[PDB]
Write a protein that binds this ligand. Structure first.
Ligand SMILES: CC(C)c1cc(Oc2c(Cl)cc(CC(=O)O)cc2Cl)ccc1O
Length: 253
């Protein structure tokens, strides 16, 4: 026990004005690159749940038509982060390929609406778990909805979502990177700045930070699992339906 005491005995350092700068740049890089009022729903006849793993081409088409902008927004987000913009093109590619699905999934998960039990892709199209699943994501769809439901309680604000994206972007998990050190350092700086921003928000939730950190694992699973679905998508879907950017970002794996 002694949880209440231990909790209160913990030091909650606020953000140092080095971290407040990061937290501001990042927060705006995020806000300016991610756009519920006039959100159009995706027709219930599209992707309505033989072949246990068949991909509904119609649904798939609807999602690939809006994926290029979604991917462009993540790239735009990265470009607005100093420590990223200064990296070699090759590095930016590897980083982007390594976190694009995660960030896109995070943005989808936070736009989750419990009322309608849907997600809003590109901040406009509202999709039901079934549709996104038949459209190609399969279980990954189940995973993003599961994450979206659980993130409602966290009340993440633009900054937490923003730093969470920076943390995902600045990873040295993939190979072929050049500036491993500089990225590593940006990672640690964002994590630290992120943690202090969470101390500042004072969430009425027990072990919030540790829990929010576990969401990163959820997103990386979604990311990794997405690479599989993508392969399955290339098998089951006409190549003409795959936009160029979509292919560059998820192929070669
Ligand atoms: C079906 C297939 C084309 C596919 C859909 C897919 O759906 C999403 C889309 Cl379009 C856009 C976003 C992010 C956003 O809301 O901007 C987030 C998500 Cl999860 C992600 C990866 C994929 O390979």
């Amino acid at each position: 026990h002694m949880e209440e005491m231990i909790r209160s005995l913990q030091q909650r350092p606020e953000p140092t004005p080095e971290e407040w700068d990061l937290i501001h740049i990042a927060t705006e890089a995020h806000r300016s690159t991610n756009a519920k009022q006039r959100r159009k729903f995706l027709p219930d006849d599209i992707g309505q749940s033989p072949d246990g793993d068949k991909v509904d081409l119609e649904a798939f088409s609807e999602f690939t038509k809006i994926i290029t902008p979604a991917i462009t927004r993540v790239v735009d987000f990265a470009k607005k982060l100093p420590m990223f913009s200064e990296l070699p093109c090759e590095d930016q590619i590897i980083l982007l390929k390594g976190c694009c699905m995660e960030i896109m999934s995070l943005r989808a998960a936070v736009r989750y609406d419990p009322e309608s039990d849907t997600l809003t892709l590109s901040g406009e199209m509202a999709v039901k778990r079934e549709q996104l699943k038949n459209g190609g994501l399969g279980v990954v769809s189940d995973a993003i909805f599961e994450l979206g439901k659980s993130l409602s309680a966290f009340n993440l604000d633009d900054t937490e979502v923003a730093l969470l994206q920076a943390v995902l972007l600045m990873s040295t998990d993939r190979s072929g990177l050049l500036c491993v050190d500089k990225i590593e350092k940006s990672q640690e700086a964002y994590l630290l700045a992120f943690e202090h921003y969470v101390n500042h928000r004072k969430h009425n939730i027990p072990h919030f930070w540790p829990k929010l950190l576990m969401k990163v694992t959820d997103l990386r699973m979604i990311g990794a699992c997405h690479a599989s679905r993508f392969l399955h998508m290339k098998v089951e879907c006409p190549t003409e339906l795959f936009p160029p950017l979509f292919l560059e970002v998820f192929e070669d794996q």
